[PDB]
Amino acid sequence: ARPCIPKSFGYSSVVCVCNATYCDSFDPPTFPALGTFSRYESTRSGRRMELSMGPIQANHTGTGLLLTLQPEQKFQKVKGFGGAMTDAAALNILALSPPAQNLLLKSYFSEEGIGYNIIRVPMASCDFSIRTYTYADTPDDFQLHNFSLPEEDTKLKIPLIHRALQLAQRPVSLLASPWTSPTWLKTNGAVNGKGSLKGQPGDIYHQTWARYFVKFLDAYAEHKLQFWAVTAENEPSAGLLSGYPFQCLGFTPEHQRDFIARDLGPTLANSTHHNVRLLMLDDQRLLLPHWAKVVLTDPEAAKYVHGIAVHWYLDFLAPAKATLGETHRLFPNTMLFASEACVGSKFWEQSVRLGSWDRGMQYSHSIITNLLYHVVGWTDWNLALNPEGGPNWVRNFVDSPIIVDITKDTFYKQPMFYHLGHFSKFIPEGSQRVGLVASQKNDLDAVALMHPDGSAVVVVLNRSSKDVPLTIKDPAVGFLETISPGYSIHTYLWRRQH
Numbered sequence: 001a002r003p004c005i006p007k008s009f010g011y012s013s014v015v016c017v018c019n020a021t022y023c024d025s026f027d028p029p030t031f032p033a034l035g036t037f038s039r040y041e042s043t044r045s046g047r048r049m050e051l052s053m054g055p056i057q058a059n060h061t062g063t064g065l066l067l068t069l070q071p072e073q074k075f076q077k078v079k080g081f082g083g084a085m086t087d088a089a090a091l092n093i094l095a096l097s098p099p100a101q102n103l104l105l106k107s108y109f110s111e112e113g114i115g116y117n118i119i120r121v122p123m124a125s126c127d128f129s130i131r132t133y134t135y136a137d138t139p140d141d142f143q144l145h146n147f148s149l150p151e152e153d154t155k156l157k158i159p160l161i162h163r164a165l166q167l168a169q170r171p172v173s174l175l176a177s178p179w180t181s182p183t184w185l186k187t188n189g190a191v192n193g194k195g196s197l198k199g200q201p202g203d204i205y206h207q208t209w210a211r212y213f214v215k216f217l218d219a220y221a222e223h224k225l226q227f228w229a230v231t232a233e234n235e236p237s238a239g240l241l242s243g244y245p246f247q248c249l250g251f252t253p254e255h256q257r258d259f260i261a262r263d264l265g266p267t268l269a270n271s272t273h274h275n276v277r278l279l280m281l282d283d284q285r286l287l288l289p290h291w292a293k294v295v296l297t298d299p300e301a302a303k304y305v306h307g308i309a310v311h312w313y314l315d316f317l318a319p320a321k322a323t324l325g326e327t328h329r330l331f332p333n334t335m336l337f338a339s340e341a342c343v344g345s346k347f348w349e350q351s352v353r354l355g356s357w358d359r360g361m362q363y364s365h366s367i368i369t370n371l372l373y374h375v376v377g378w379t380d381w382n383l384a385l386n387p388e389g390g391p392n393w394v395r396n397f398v399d400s401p402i403i404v405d406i407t408k409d410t411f412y413k414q415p416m417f418y419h420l421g422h423f424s425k426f427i428p429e430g431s432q433r434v435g436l437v438a439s440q441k442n443d444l445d446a447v448a449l450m451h452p453d454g455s456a457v458v459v460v461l462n463r464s465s466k467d468v469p470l471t472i473k474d475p476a477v478g479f480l481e482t483i484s485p486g487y488s489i490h491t492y493l494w495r496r497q498h
């Protein structure tokens, strides 16, 4: 529909520039003709989800790389893809003119954009806030009579979520996560630092905290927003650390187990929100499988836990097989979900690198890795940040797929945006990952899935500098002859005739 307006800021690739009168967009989604495939291509050299079509052929000869679809080898069903409506994201979006706001929200939530279907919503303040607050700051209010949503929710986050929902054709799922409780519930009496709930699971402090989750869901429901899932705490390990700089609430895995079993599970289950799913952990993968073992081997906690939420700090190394792999082996019926990912958080790296192809490749490589380890969805962190990677009240700045520049009423779509979109746009909720077998060793990263309507989607990432000729074989349908260019990402889509 409208192509990328590219701009270089001196990094390895370009951003696409959007403003009050222009943004890149797709035509309404349509599948290629039967016997035809669609290819969407992005490249470091500057192509951004460009559409081409080719024939599916009956015949194939040669000893080049062959990737054979395994459509009957079925793995996880996908929940979807999205990002976080933090206070920082909301402030940045709303600092744009009304037209630019609309083009930014369409970029993410419309079918002429990349089709996000998940929004993560912080329960009150986090580091990506400019004010520290909870919903119940009046002290000793154990019945939560003074629970209320402030303007950060009622004027910023809620209106934007409603606007996203109006643009989306896909059903959108909301996920809620708290960073801190009110300080009068905490051992340290502060939003940050090392501190946990006072007392022990099953007591008034823990019961009040569980009730706060229901009050939050009730309050959002009065604004006609319902949640798909909540997490039991954002990064519960952080609040166990001396000097933790921003909002946190510390739980050991045993504390989380007992809080879920005695307070949060029962309280949610006895509420009008009993259909809301509960995800445990919401933290870094090196805590697995240990945390899952602690919580899920207790039947009283296990009956309340629908899934395990994991965070991806893409700047740092950690094992995937020994964490996600082992967790799936031990608890194959408990879904894994990636609830936060970010890059640029190291103090010594530029928070925002406008046009970084490398950071784009980090996003898509992480998404592929997550899907190959049975994870059902992937959620970015802040939907938009300023050029400093903020605002953030402790200056914990990071990168974002969309960077807003209010002095030009402009926003920039980073390589990260397109790398995420190669998955989000083309993998509807309910898609199922299927097998994809390589005929020979190769440098590509790839994943295949089947849509609910039976159609095929394959994503191929080439992080090498070399162009790799390859063929995709769909045993029911025929052969796709293609190339994976160096420093590219492709998404292939086709209809599958019986």
Ligand SMILES: *[C@@H]1O[C@H](CO)[C@@H](O[C@@H]2O[C@H](CO)[C@@H](O[C@@H]3O[C@H](CO)[C@@H](O)[C@H](O)[C@H]3NC(C)=O)[C@H](O)[C@H]2NC(C)=O)[C@H](O)[C@H]1NC(C)=O
Binding pocket: 005, 018, 019, 020, 021, 022
């Ligand atoms: C929102 O962004 C739009 C896209 O950049 C702006 O529209 C562009 O304005 C340019 C300046 O009038 C037009 O001419 C081109 O400008 C570029 C520099 O940015 C030059 O390199 C080109 O040589 C020049 N081309 C010619 C033939 O003169 C662009 O044609 C025009 N693009 C489109 C798609 O309309 C908007 O002005 C901007 N909106 C606001 C409110 O700032």
Ligand SMILES: *[C@@H]1O[C@H](CO)[C@@H](O)[C@H](O)[C@H]1NC(C)=O
Binding pocket: 058, 059
């Ligand atoms: C494909 O395969 C066989 C090879 O023997 C041949 O009969 C057929 O005509 C070929 N089709 C095309 C379109 O090349």
Ligand SMILES: *[C@@H]1O[C@H](CO)[C@@H](O)[C@H](O)[C@H]1NC(C)=O
Binding pocket: 267, 270, 271
């Ligand atoms: C359980 O549910 C009932 C309403 O069905 C409610 O009145 C009661 O307070 C709930 N119990 C709690 C919150 O402990």
Ligand SMILES: c1ccc(CC2CCNCC2)cc1
Binding pocket: 029, 030, 031, 111, 115, 170, 425, 426, 427, 428, 493
């Ligand atoms: C072109 C682009 C994207 C797609 C997939 C979408 C998934 C959500 N429903 C509409 C189709 C198909 C063809």
Ligand SMILES: c1ccc(CC2CCNCC2)cc1
Binding pocket: 039, 041, 051, 052, 482, 483, 484, 485
């Ligand atoms: C490999 C990569 C991309 C393509 C599609 C081409 C790219 C150039 N513009 C026209 C469409 C084919 C094979």
Ligand SMILES: [K+]
Binding pocket: 134, 135, 136, 137, 138, 146, 147, 148, 149
């Ligand atoms: K209040």
Ligand SMILES: [K+]
Binding pocket: 344, 345, 346, 347, 348, 349, 350, 351, 397, 398
């Ligand atoms: K940084």
